[PDB]
């Protein structure tokens, strides 16, 4: 509604805000930065051994 | 919707924007400045003589 959020107004969010990275509410600004746990490289078989 | 109508700003508009000063559309920010013709002191009897 302000609109001045997306040009020079970068946002950084934790993994809680991102939540499920598969689904995006379409209101998330492009270029959103999020800190998330390694769900891609750290596969389930690797964690069980650890 | 942006919300930045006026908080420490000032909006200057001509007499066209003000229009009829009796009615305000309730969206005009407080502190609006208009350059209106003298309808108060310059009464109609004075205008006819001039």
UniProtKB/Swiss-Prot annotation, chains A, B:
It is linked to Intellectual developmental disorder, autosomal dominant 6, with or without seizures: A disorder characterized by significantly below average general intellectual functioning associated with impairments in adaptive behavior and manifested during the developmental period. MRD6 additional features may include seizures, hypotonia, abnormal movements, such as dystonia, and autistic features. Developmental and epileptic encephalopathy 27: A form of epileptic encephalopathy, a heterogeneous group of severe early-onset epilepsies characterized by refractory seizures, neurodevelopmental impairment, and poor prognosis. Development is normal prior to seizure onset, after which cognitive and motor delays become apparent. Phosphorylated on tyrosine residues. It is found in: Cell membrane; Postsynaptic cell membrane; Cell projection, Dendrite; Late endosome. Component of N-methyl-D-aspartate (NMDA) receptors (NMDARs) that function as heterotetrameric, ligand-gated cation channels with high calcium permeability and voltage-dependent block by Mg(2+). Participates in synaptic plasticity for learning and memory formation by contributing to the long-term depression (LTD) of hippocampus membrane currents. Channel activation requires binding of the neurotransmitter L-glutamate to the GluN2 subunit, glycine or D-serine binding to the GluN1 subunit, plus membrane depolarization to eliminate channel inhibition by Mg(2+). Primarily found in the fronto-parieto-temporal cortex and hippocampus pyramidal cells, lower expression in the basal ganglia. This is Glutamate receptor ionotropic, NMDA 2B. The chain holds residues 246 to 295 of 1484 of the full protein. It comes from Homo sapiens. Heterotetramer. Forms heterotetrameric channels composed of two GluN1/zeta subunits (GRIN1), and two identical GluN2/epsilon subunits (GRIN2A, GRIN2B, GRIN2C or GRIN2D) or GluN3 subunits (GRIN3A or GRIN3B) (in vitro). Can also form heterotetrameric channels that contain at least two GluN1 subunits and at least two different GluN2 subunits (or a combination of one GluN2 and one GluN3 subunits) (in vitro). In vivo, the subunit composition may depend on the expression levels of the different subunits. Found in a complex with GRIN1 and GRIN3B. Found in a complex with GRIN1, GRIN3A and PPP2CB. Zn(2+) binds at residue 39. The extracellular N-terminal domain (NTD) endows NMDARs with a unique capacity for allosteric modulation, harboring several binding sites for small molecule ligands that act as subunit-specific allosteric modulators of ion channel activity. A hydrophobic region that gives rise to the prediction of a transmembrane span does not cross the membrane, but is part of a discontinuously helical region that dips into the membrane and is probably part of the pore and of the selectivity filter. Belongs to the glutamate-gated ion channel (TC 1.A.10.1) family. NR2B/GRIN2B subfamily.
